[PDB]
Amino acid sequence: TKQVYIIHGYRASSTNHWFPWLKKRLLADGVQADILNMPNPLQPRLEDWLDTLSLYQHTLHENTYLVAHSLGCPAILRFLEHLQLRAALGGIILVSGFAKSLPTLQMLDEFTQGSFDHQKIIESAKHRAVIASKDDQIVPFSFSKDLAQQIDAALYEVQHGGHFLEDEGFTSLPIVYDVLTSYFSK
Secondary structure, three states, X not given: OOEEXXXXXXXXXXXXXXXXXXXXXXXXXXXXXXXXXXOOXXXXXXXXXXXXXXXXXXXXXXXXXEEEEOOHHHHHHHHHHOOOOOOOEEEEEEEOOOOOOOOOOHHHHHHOOOOOOHHHHHHHEEEEEEEEEOOOOOOOHHHHHHHHHHOOOEEEEEOOOOOOOHHHOOOOOHHHHHHHHHHHHO
């Protein structure tokens, strides 16, 4: 049975941005999606985000898919590095993903300090994609393209996407639903 988990970033929760839209759009296809909240989204700590993800660890299988936004991206990358898996998850989609310090949000450096084991991430997710906005002023586009290269992920550029936030109009995001769905047909 397919399962999609949706993981938010800094200063967000399950009710923000495009997450409710994506959950409901998936439900229209009979696909179960759960938006996960992380602890202390205003002062996030990597170890606590990883401990929360670990609450779900026993449910992760070959038909599980993880969709993350912004800070949720390096969090799930760190999670997969330390996960013992019998087989790869179905896939990951990293919206505005990054794996190094964000100059305008250095308070979040602990989530990306240190190199990542790229091979383990590649082996942990059958299908991989990064969706990124060319005019993102929080996560520079180049950082998302860099990450896509490091983890051999398909990169989808949106020329004018801001940072895919509700205050920029992104209470929906069809590209994420369509990229995800293409994984299911494969």
